[PDB]
Ligand code: HEM
């Protein structure tokens with residue numbers, strides 16, 4: 001549970017993401033793959049890419065960053081009332097992609113890093129704390145789903 005004020009701070013910084021969804025999505029994915037290379041092993045698509053410039057030139061990676069952030073943005077806008085949005089996401093990520101909760105922690109980290117790097121003025125401590133709680137609630141809810149689907153204990 002976040003307060004209305006905490007949700008506003010989340011949505012305030014997310015509006016800056018929506019000015020350039022693709023660019024943010026590329027920075028988030030590249031940060032994830034750099035910080036946690038094992039996550040890039042959930043792939044052929046662009047498993048192979050070796051330099052940052054190669055990563056930035058990949059159409060596939062750019063599409064993928066938009067796929068993630070579009071879906072996360074719709075979730076955040078629900079302000080916790082997100083069971084319908086998480087249902088299909090949990091289904092694919094538990095039963096087809098098989099993404100462990102620890103990878104969702106890794107991407108949450110990357111998200112926070114990029115937001116702080118790009119919008120420090122709209123991502124001070126209170127805003128950081130709100131985004132952390134929103135991303136935590138997401139993780140918690142998706143983990144309960146995963147188990148319902150028989151995945152990951
Ligand atoms: C905030 C976190 C996440 C959101 C909102 C998200 C959302 C999505 C959406 C909307 C799709 C396309 C539809 C679907 O298959 O359900 C998808 C596909 C996929 N996602 Fe996630 N995702 C995130 C976490 C992850 C993480 C941590 C990985 C780590 C490797 C990952 C890799 C997968 C893969 C491999 C696909 C298939 C992509 C393809 O078709 O080429 N996702 N994701």
Ligand SMILES: Oc1c(Cl)cc(Cl)cc1Cl
Nearest residue numbers: 029043045064067068107
């Ligand atoms: O690493 C990812 C890839 Cl390759 C594709 C999607 Cl759609 C989402 C994520 Cl987080």
